[PDB]
Amino acid sequence: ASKVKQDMPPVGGYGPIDYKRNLPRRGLSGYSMFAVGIGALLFGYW
Amino acid sequence: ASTSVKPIFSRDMNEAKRRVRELYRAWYREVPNTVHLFQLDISVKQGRDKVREMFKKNAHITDPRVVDLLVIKGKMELEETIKVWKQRTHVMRFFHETEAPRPKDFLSKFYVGHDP
Amino acid sequence: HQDLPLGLMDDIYEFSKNFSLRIDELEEMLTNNRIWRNRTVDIGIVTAEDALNYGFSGVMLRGSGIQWDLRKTQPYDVYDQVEFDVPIGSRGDCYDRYLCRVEEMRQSIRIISQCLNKMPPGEIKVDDAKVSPPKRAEMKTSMESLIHHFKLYT
Amino acid sequence: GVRTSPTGEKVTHTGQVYDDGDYRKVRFVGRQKEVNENFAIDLIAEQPVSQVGSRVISCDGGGGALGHPRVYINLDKETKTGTCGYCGLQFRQQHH
Amino acid sequence: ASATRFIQWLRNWASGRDLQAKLQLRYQEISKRTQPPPKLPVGPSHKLSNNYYCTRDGRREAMPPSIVMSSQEKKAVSPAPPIKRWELSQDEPYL
Amino acid sequence: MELLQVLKRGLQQVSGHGGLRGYLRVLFRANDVRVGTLVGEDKYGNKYY
Amino acid sequence: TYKYVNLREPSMDMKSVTDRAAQTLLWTELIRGLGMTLSYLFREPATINYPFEKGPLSPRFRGEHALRRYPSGEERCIACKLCEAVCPAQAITIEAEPRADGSRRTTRYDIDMTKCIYCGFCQEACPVDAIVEGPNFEFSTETHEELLYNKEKLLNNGDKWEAEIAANIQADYLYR
Amino acid sequence: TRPTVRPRNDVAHKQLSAFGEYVAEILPKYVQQVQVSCFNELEICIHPDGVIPVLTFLRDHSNAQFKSLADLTAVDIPTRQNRFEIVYNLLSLRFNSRIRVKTYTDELTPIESSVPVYKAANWYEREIWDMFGVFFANHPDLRRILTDYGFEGHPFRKDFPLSGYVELRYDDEVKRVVAEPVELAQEFRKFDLNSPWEAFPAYRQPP
Amino acid sequence: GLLKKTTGLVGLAVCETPHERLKILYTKILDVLGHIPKNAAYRKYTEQITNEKLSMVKAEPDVKKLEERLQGGQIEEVILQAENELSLARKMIQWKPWEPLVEEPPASQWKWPI
Ligand SMILES: CCCCCCCCCCCCCCCCCC(=O)OC[C@H](COP(=O)(O)OCCN)OC(=O)CCCCCCCCCCCCCCCCC
Ligand code: SF4
Ligand code: SF4
Ligand SMILES: [Zn+2]
């Protein structure tokens, strides 16, 4: 006796699948970005 | 009631002929501009005779509704030439320059094939 | 026409597992790029009333705030057994419509993840041999199945 | 098998060959005429006649679902053999 | 998958994500190109009894359109009940 | 250290094709100098890896 | 259910407003885009080395039509004309007559490979697995006339690709 | 339930029959026939003079609100006095329903343009003109849309041949693309497929 | 009772006085329907559904709860539909679709299959 065999998902189902937007956060704040930029100018002028 | 029908533009042949003539004047005055914009190899006289031939074919119509349609198609065919939506190939299709003459007499048709 | 070959659903799962990352990389190039926004924001604005009267459908409606999607309002097949969200725009311009299609790609990955897990067993065409052709094995042994194969294909 | 015409052009298994004065032969100048060398009428004539011990035998062409529709052949006449209408194989009843 | 550790670090930092976990090239997680033979099932109409075709003939149960009006106190009606309002998703209401 | 191993594999492709002459032959015919496991050869001379 | 894609209210505190001023003046999100292209510069490209490498296919692939034989050498086709009836492009032309031995066999079997839409209906209709679409997809020609196959060209293809055609049909006939 | 037979929805069949009567009571001047199919679709058949009244009522009435024109097309039946059957397919987002409105005309009788009611009808009516030759009165811009410039005839008419009357070609002598009568290297083959046995007795016609 | 910042539909502006605007329009519709014959079905039906929508407005001072009662989406959508009915009523007077059928179709105009 041979059982039926056709394409089926594995017992318990497949693992979870990510679908949501995941644009991460990087970099410093505006205050610190401006502080580093002005600091570079002051050293350059000196 | 059977012969009572809705008109398209003209209620009788007398008004229809007015539209036919206005259309003919439009085509007559456009040939020189057409023969120039498309750089055709025909002359203006040849162009204006083709318009005459096309109008002559439908000279036996006595239905005002039919005449209205022929004018509607003529005005459509005219708007394509003025605005250069056609191309030199489309304009020259009225002349059949690449089709060999086909005989009109019985004997010649007999020699070549079976068509009447 | 045919049933899925063995092993295809596993390969669909491996593809779907990584696709959401591909969309994110696409959004790192377009969504916040100021040059992209300038080309698509407040360009081609459609009012919710002009869209209906001009015959629009799909994201041309959903971009202008009209809440309409045939998959949810007039469902067909088994679209009423899956969960997804319909993106909706607010300004009805090119940028909002670009966000609706990017977000609809994510909701498709959500539907696909449910089709792979809720795929039932059975046959793959209606078991009425006056519409769908019989199996080739039974078309070569049974007289009715040969008659119905002959007539359906001629 | 393939036999050549008096003009040197091969004859196909359907019997096709251009006559000597047929202008259509010019298509083969500097080229060739595609002819399949395995004549099916000769190949099936080499197959031995299968001896069976029943009035009626069945043929499916071999391979089961990979053959042809299954047909039953009557072997009551000893003057000739039973031939399958699909694959051309022949069957004969053993001395009865 | 053959990228050195340094280049793996450089690519991950540049994109801001962990690319090595979701490579867009397939190596060994794919199905074998040779598979065991299947044995597909059969439909509900594969029976030896109680299976007459007149009891499952869909095409023969179609009927011509019913005529409600033809030229040859009543409460107003609409084609269907008004469509119910949609609900914001608790999954992610705002993108 | 891993930089060193990359160069070692780059050199072992030269030896894996039969020296410089074989290495250059597959660089101009195939535009690729990878080394694989021979799977077999057909009667016309093609080699499969 | 539905969700809004572009209905956010940006904050108006000083830190948030300064964050967008740094983004406007220092081009932060543009340089974030340069980094993504930099990452792809160090990823292995997906290009394959054709013609020495080939793109993967499956046993169901539909390529060059062909005519098969039985293991005895007899042709499988019996001129039933089901394929000619089902071909949506009318790319098949057939003529048949009794053979010298009385068999039902074709005397013409042409496929116009420029009318053909490579759809596979011819091989679904065939009751004897005679006309199949093989796995060959590299058969481009230099003239239009070489793509008008006749029975001799189709039988040559079958003899030429039988080793691969039979193995594919072995791998898929359980799904048909 | 029967696994192979499409299920019936008697609720939607009763609601669409009520609304069909509702429409015919409000426009007796135009409605000639209302029918509901066995798969729950509603057809309102009207005199061609009511194209604007009937459509305007269905778009603007508070219980109809058919604000979207799904499609507009024509069907050619050579055996009728009025060959052409004009079909309007409409949609209602408020009540989530569809409705079909049909009228008729012939080669010479015009029909009123629907652009005032539906701006979507602008291109559909050009397509009906181009392919069937039905003139729409008061159309802002009526002309061929799909066929080639200078094309003669209306190709979707049942009597227009499948392969047309002319075919194009490049002629080296005149250095342009020419039009010539059509000759086919292989004639289209005509199959007589209909079986001589009745398929559906439910649709049998009186003899 | 807070006013809404947006209707969500492009080109549809928020209305600060939904109750006042609807009473005017519904009253205007009922006054236009008075010029239509008494027996015409368009008048009988439109009055039936206009009054019950006008009674819902005059018995529900909350906008959010009013929308649930009317079942017409945003209150601005219900105002837009009132303006469409008013325009429709003004056009039915000129068309007079309550008259008998203009003409019968030919004998087999709606027969299918032929
Ligand atoms: C709201 C605030 C807006 C910003 C206000 C201005 C910010 C402060 C000034 C910085 C901006 C101007 C740029 C000046 C560049 C000077 C570079 C530097 O900082 O180097 C300091 C340097 C140290 O001394 P040094 O000479 O190097 O010692 C070795 C001697 N053997 O010494 C020097 O470099 C020389 C000294 C230069 C002094 C010039 C600035 C004086 C301006 C008056 C000070 C008050 C600031 C202005 C207030 C009004 C603003 C509206
Ligand atoms: S693949 Fe389709 S179109 Fe091509 S010959 Fe076969 S049946 Fe005809
Ligand atoms: S369907 Fe098969 S057997 Fe029939 S004519 Fe075509 S190739 Fe021959
Ligand atoms: Zn056999």
Side-chain angles (χ1 to χ4, degrees):
Chain A
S2 59
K3 292 285 290 301
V4 168
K5 187 180 289 186
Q6 68 191 141
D7 212 24
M8 287 288 292
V11 175
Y14 293 101
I17 292 166
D18 297 340
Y19 62 89
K20 292 178 183 177
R21 175 195 279 180
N22 185 13
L23 305 184
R25 294 280 294 277
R26 314 177 71 188
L28 311 175
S29 54
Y31 287 144
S32 39
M33 277 185 185
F34 281 114
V36 177
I38 301 292
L41 290 176
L42 295 178
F43 185 72
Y45 303 153
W46 176 81
Chain B
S2 61
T3 64
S4 57
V5 298
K6 190 164 82 170
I8 307 183
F9 285 110
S10 307
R11 310 186 64 84
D12 61 77
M13 287 296 296
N14 208 256
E15 301 185 11
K17 290 185 181 63
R18 184 190 103 270
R19 296 173 170 280
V20 176
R21 293 189 224 94
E22 296 168 339
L23 177 56
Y24 182 85
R25 295 166 68 155
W27 271 106
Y28 187 94
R29 305 190 90 88
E30 185 65 13
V31 176
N33 293 321
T34 288
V35 172
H36 184 57
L37 257 57
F38 292 93
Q39 294 182 351
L40 307 190
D41 294 322
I42 55 166
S43 62
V44 179
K45 182 174 187 303
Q46 285 178 1
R48 269 165 182 161
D49 301 333
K50 178 57 65 183
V51 176
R52 184 67 145 279
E53 179 184 6
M54 292 291 99
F55 277 77
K56 202 66 58 53
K57 305 199 309 305
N58 310 130
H60 64 274
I61 306 303
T62 65
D63 188 327
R65 291 191 300 174
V66 173
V67 175
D68 285 321
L69 277 177
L70 291 170
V71 170
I72 286 170
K73 293 171 176 292
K75 292 174 68 61
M76 285 179 192
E77 207 95 344
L78 180 60
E79 179 179 22
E80 293 182 357
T81 319
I82 272 70
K83 295 180 176 182
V84 195
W85 293 344
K86 286 182 190 264
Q87 293 143 285
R88 174 149 70 265
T89 48
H90 297 101
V91 176
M92 291 299 299
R93 279 166 194 178
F94 292 98
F95 295 90
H96 306 259
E97 283 205 348
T98 58
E99 296 177 34
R102 198 156 182 75
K104 290 82 176 180
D105 59 318
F106 174 88
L107 248 178
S108 295
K109 295 185 296 184
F110 176 85
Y111 290 146
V112 299
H114 304 95
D115 298 313
Chain C
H1 180 48
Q2 285 186 93
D3 192 0
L4 303 179
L6 295 178
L8 184 70
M9 288 175 58
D10 294 333
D11 281 316
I12 295 174
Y13 166 71
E14 298 291 341
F15 167 88
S16 310
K17 206 203 306 183
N18 300 329
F19 191 71
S20 174
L21 180 58
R22 302 281 83 84
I23 306 183
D24 291 332
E25 300 176 342
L26 172 60
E27 294 196 85
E28 289 283 352
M29 304 280 286
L30 302 183
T31 56
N32 291 311
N33 178 280
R34 82 187 62 187
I35 307 175
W36 176 255
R37 288 180 59 96
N38 289 348
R39 296 297 305 268
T40 49
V41 167
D42 288 328
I43 303 294
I45 284 171
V46 190
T47 57
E49 210 63 31
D50 282 335
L52 293 172
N53 203 256
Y54 269 87
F56 291 5
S57 53
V59 302
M60 297 298 294
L61 296 183
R62 295 192 277 279
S64 297
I66 296 164
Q67 294 172 11
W68 189 249
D69 189 318
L70 294 174
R71 285 180 290 166
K72 289 212 172 294
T73 64
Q74 299 171 10
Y76 49 95
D77 284 328
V78 296
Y79 270 114
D80 50 314
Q81 302 183 38
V82 293
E83 310 285 5
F84 63 104
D85 295 329
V86 173
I88 296 297
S90 286
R91 302 179 71 170
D93 58 357
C94 287
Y95 186 70
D96 275 7
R97 289 190 280 269
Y98 152 81
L99 285 180
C100 288
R101 290 188 187 99
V102 170
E103 181 60 26
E104 270 187 8
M105 281 189 289
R106 303 186 178 284
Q107 300 297 315
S108 283
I109 295 295
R110 186 180 175 189
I111 297 170
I112 288 168
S113 179
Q114 299 168 58
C115 287
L116 295 173
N117 285 323
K118 293 167 65 59
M119 183 76 72
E123 68 285 15
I124 49 74
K125 71 183 75 171
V126 63
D127 214 14
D128 179 5
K130 297 181 193 294
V131 179
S132 287
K135 243 84 80 68
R136 294 189 72 83
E138 60 197 14
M139 177 270 291
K140 287 167 172 173
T141 53
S142 305
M143 186 59 207
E144 284 92 335
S145 291
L146 182 49
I147 288 177
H148 286 54
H149 173 91
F150 194 105
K151 298 294 296 185
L152 286 184
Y153 278 102
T154 67
Chain D
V2 179
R3 21 70 63 86
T4 305
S5 67
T7 179
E9 172 174 318
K10 289 156 69 180
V11 175
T12 59
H13 70 278
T14 76
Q16 196 278 346
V17 71
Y18 288 139
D19 298 330
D20 53 68
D22 201 328
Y23 78 96
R24 286 178 296 187
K25 302 161 75 73
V26 64
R27 68 183 66 188
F28 301 135
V29 176
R31 271 126 72 165
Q32 53 109 14
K33 182 186 175 179
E34 203 89 333
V35 175
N36 187 254
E37 307 295 344
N38 299 318
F39 281 25
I41 189 172
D42 300 334
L43 288 175
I44 190 57
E46 308 172 4
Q47 291 298 317
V49 182
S50 184
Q51 310 285 332
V52 292
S54 46
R55 300 256 308 279
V56 169
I57 204 67
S58 69
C59 187
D60 67 354
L66 298 166
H68 60 68
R70 190 201 298 158
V71 292
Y72 295 77
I73 304 165
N74 177 275
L75 317 169
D76 274 356
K77 277 198 297 183
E78 305 296 354
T79 180
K80 56 180 254 296
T81 55
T83 306
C84 180
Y86 282 92
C87 67
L89 294 178
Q90 286 166 311
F91 305 83
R92 192 193 300 274
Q93 197 175 13
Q94 289 194 40
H95 68 70
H96 51 49
Chain E
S2 66
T4 54
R5 283 167 54 188
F6 175 75
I7 293 299
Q8 287 192 26
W9 171 87
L10 180 61
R11 58 168 60 160
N12 289 11
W13 170 80
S15 56
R17 292 174 187 77
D18 184 12
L19 302 172
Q20 199 74 7
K22 285 184 176 180
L23 283 172
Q24 54 195 125
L25 305 164
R26 304 158 293 177
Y27 290 85
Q28 288 288 14
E29 72 282 1
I30 60 174
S31 312
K32 275 64 184 63
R33 310 301 291 184
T34 297
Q35 298 281 347
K39 192 191 182 303
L40 302 181
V42 292
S45 301
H46 286 75
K47 291 184 292 182
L48 298 175
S49 61
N50 191 36
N51 202 37
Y52 281 100
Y53 186 83
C54 51
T55 60
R56 54 184 174 83
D57 187 359
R59 292 189 311 164
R60 267 50 178 272
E61 298 187 6
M63 293 291 178
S66 57
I67 316 300
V68 317
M69 174 271 170
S70 188
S71 67
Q72 66 174 9
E73 184 62 16
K74 186 78 94 302
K75 207 276 193 186
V77 288
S78 52
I83 187 179
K84 185 177 65 173
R85 213 175 64 266
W86 284 3
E87 296 296 335
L88 254 175
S89 60
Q90 300 89 359
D91 197 68
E92 187 182 29
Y94 294 86
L95 186 66
Chain F
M1 225 259 354
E2 219 167 352
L3 209 325
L4 220 306
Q5 300 295 335
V6 168
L7 300 170
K8 285 183 176 179
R9 293 195 298 272
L11 283 166
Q12 89 185 357
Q13 286 176 349
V14 172
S15 72
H17 287 288
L20 185 67
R21 183 172 294 273
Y23 176 92
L24 292 176
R25 192 163 89 105
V26 72
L27 179 66
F28 289 109
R29 296 192 68 208
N31 309 115
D32 189 71
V33 300
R34 285 181 307 163
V35 179
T37 307
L38 179 61
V39 169
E41 173 175 7
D42 62 351
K43 67 183 69 171
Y44 316 90
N46 301 325
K47 300 176 178 294
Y48 301 92
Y49 302 87
Chain G
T1 57
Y2 73 106
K3 60 195 291 178
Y4 295 121
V5 295
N6 199 21
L7 190 65
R8 286 297 186 91
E9 286 287 4
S11 59
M12 297 301 296
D13 54 313
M14 243 296 135
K15 184 185 177 303
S16 293
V17 171
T18 299
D19 276 357
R20 294 190 299 272
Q23 177 171 337
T24 291
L25 293 174
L26 308 186
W27 306 342
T28 51
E29 92 295 4
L30 290 180
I31 290 168
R32 198 195 175 105
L34 289 177
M36 185 58 63
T37 44
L38 185 69
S39 67
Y40 269 85
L41 176 61
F42 295 104
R43 296 176 204 195
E44 181 172 1
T47 309
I48 68 176
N49 194 37
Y50 188 87
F52 306 88
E53 300 162 10
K54 317 293 273 291
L57 295 183
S58 76
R60 299 188 186 178
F61 181 66
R62 307 200 303 261
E64 197 176 27
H65 285 71
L67 281 177
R68 298 185 59 229
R69 300 176 180 265
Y70 285 100
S72 69
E74 171 64 298
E75 304 173 16
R76 277 177 182 266
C77 180
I78 40 79
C80 82
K81 296 177 171 271
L82 261 52
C83 61
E84 183 179 14
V86 68
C87 183
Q90 288 200 349
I92 301 165
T93 316
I94 299 166
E95 296 190 16
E97 76 184 9
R99 200 163 62 179
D101 57 356
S103 301
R104 184 193 177 101
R105 304 289 156 177
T106 60
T107 48
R108 179 199 292 278
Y109 192 98
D110 304 328
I111 302 185
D112 185 318
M113 306 288 283
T114 57
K115 293 189 187 87
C116 165
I117 56 157
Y118 300 79
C119 74
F121 291 8
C122 46
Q123 67 176 3
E124 301 169 20
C126 193
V128 305
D129 301 17
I131 184 61
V132 313
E133 279 197 275
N136 184 33
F137 62 96
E138 296 151 314
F139 60 107
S140 52
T141 62
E142 295 189 21
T143 70
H144 190 341
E145 300 79 15
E146 297 173 47
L147 288 176
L148 275 40
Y149 291 2
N150 56 4
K151 185 175 176 183
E152 309 305 332
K153 175 67 174 179
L154 283 164
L155 275 175
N156 283 0
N157 282 351
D159 298 1
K160 176 179 172 188
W161 295 95
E162 177 59 17
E164 185 176 2
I165 287 171
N168 284 345
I169 296 176
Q170 184 67 40
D172 197 83
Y173 84 106
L174 282 171
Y175 300 99
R176 299 172 184 179
Chain H
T1 183
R2 258 105 87 259
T4 52
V5 311
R6 176 186 171 89
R8 260 180 169 75
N9 183 346
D10 295 319
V11 169
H13 192 264
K14 185 171 70 175
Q15 297 167 354
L16 288 173
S17 301
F19 185 78
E21 302 166 4
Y22 177 84
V23 175
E25 292 163 11
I26 294 170
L27 309 132
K29 185 176 186 183
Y30 301 120
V31 176
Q32 301 173 353
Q33 184 168 329
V34 177
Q35 52 186 12
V36 181
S37 65
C38 74
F39 41 87
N40 307 345
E41 299 198 355
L42 177 71
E43 287 183 334
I44 311 294
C45 305
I46 72 179
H47 197 277
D49 286 338
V51 173
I52 298 301
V54 177
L55 290 174
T56 309
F57 171 84
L58 288 166
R59 186 195 61 171
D60 289 350
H61 194 65
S62 302
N63 271 18
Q65 288 170 78
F66 293 94
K67 319 206 78 64
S68 186
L69 177 60
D71 189 70
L72 159 59
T73 191
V75 185
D76 190 16
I77 304 91
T79 184
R80 294 174 184 173
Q81 306 178 15
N82 308 89
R83 306 170 57 176
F84 306 116
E85 168 183 295
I86 314 294
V87 188
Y88 298 85
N89 264 276
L90 306 168
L91 173 66
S92 171
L93 291 67
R94 181 58 56 208
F95 303 109
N96 198 29
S97 293
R98 297 179 177 275
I99 191 170
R100 185 154 55 252
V101 180
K102 298 159 71 180
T103 171
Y104 54 82
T105 168
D106 53 78
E107 296 90 335
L108 295 161
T109 304
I111 282 176
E112 189 66 40
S113 182
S114 310
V115 181
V117 189
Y118 296 107
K119 292 278 114 65
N122 196 316
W123 274 26
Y124 290 110
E125 286 176 331
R126 290 173 54 183
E127 185 175 353
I128 295 181
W129 163 251
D130 187 16
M131 309 309 284
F132 294 98
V134 169
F135 183 71
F136 284 90
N138 301 332
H139 199 276
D141 182 1
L142 198 68
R143 48 183 171 95
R144 82 178 62 264
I145 189 172
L146 288 176
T147 41
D148 190 4
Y149 305 109
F151 190 91
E152 300 169 355
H154 308 285
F156 280 16
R157 286 185 179 184
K158 223 68 181 170
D159 58 328
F160 190 87
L162 177 57
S163 293
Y165 289 108
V166 307
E167 62 182 348
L168 269 52
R169 174 181 74 85
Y170 177 76
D171 187 61
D172 192 73
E173 177 181 309
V174 294
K175 296 294 188 299
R176 70 175 124 90
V177 173
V178 287
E180 298 181 340
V182 65
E183 303 181 13
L184 292 166
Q186 187 176 15
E187 181 194 6
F188 182 84
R189 282 162 293 175
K190 181 186 68 172
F191 295 157
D192 284 356
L193 296 177
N194 293 347
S195 178
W197 283 100
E198 186 178 40
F200 311 108
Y203 299 81
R204 190 185 300 129
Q205 306 179 31
Chain I
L2 179 63
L3 194 64
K4 56 162 63 62
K5 184 162 57 276
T6 186
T7 48
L9 300 173
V10 174
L12 196 63
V14 184
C15 190
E16 298 178 1
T17 59
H19 284 80
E20 280 62 8
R21 186 80 176 94
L22 281 170
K23 290 193 196 79
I24 299 172
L25 282 161
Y26 286 147
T27 288
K28 290 180 78 173
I29 288 172
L30 296 177
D31 186 72
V32 170
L33 292 173
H35 309 159
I36 298 166
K38 185 64 170 57
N39 54 19
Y42 174 65
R43 177 179 173 174
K44 302 192 282 74
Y45 285 131
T46 311
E47 291 184 4
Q48 178 190 137
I49 61 177
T50 305
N51 286 326
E52 64 185 359
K53 292 201 297 298
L54 176 55
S55 298
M56 278 185 273
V57 173
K58 293 195 295 79
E60 198 73 49
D62 191 19
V63 166
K64 255 62 90 295
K65 294 170 82 293
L66 178 60
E67 291 166 356
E68 302 288 350
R69 293 288 303 284
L70 288 176
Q71 286 177 302
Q74 302 287 16
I75 188 60
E76 286 71 17
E77 295 184 47
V78 177
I79 293 170
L80 182 57
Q81 181 50 34
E83 300 180 9
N84 291 321
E85 189 76 57
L86 178 65
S87 177
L88 172 57
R90 279 164 179 162
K91 291 178 179 169
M92 298 295 260
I93 292 160
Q94 298 302 317
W95 289 329
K96 303 181 185 63
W98 46 85
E99 300 186 359
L101 181 58
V102 299
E103 189 180 8
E104 295 283 10
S108 301
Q109 184 65 37
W110 300 121
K111 179 160 78 73
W112 193 253
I114 66 179

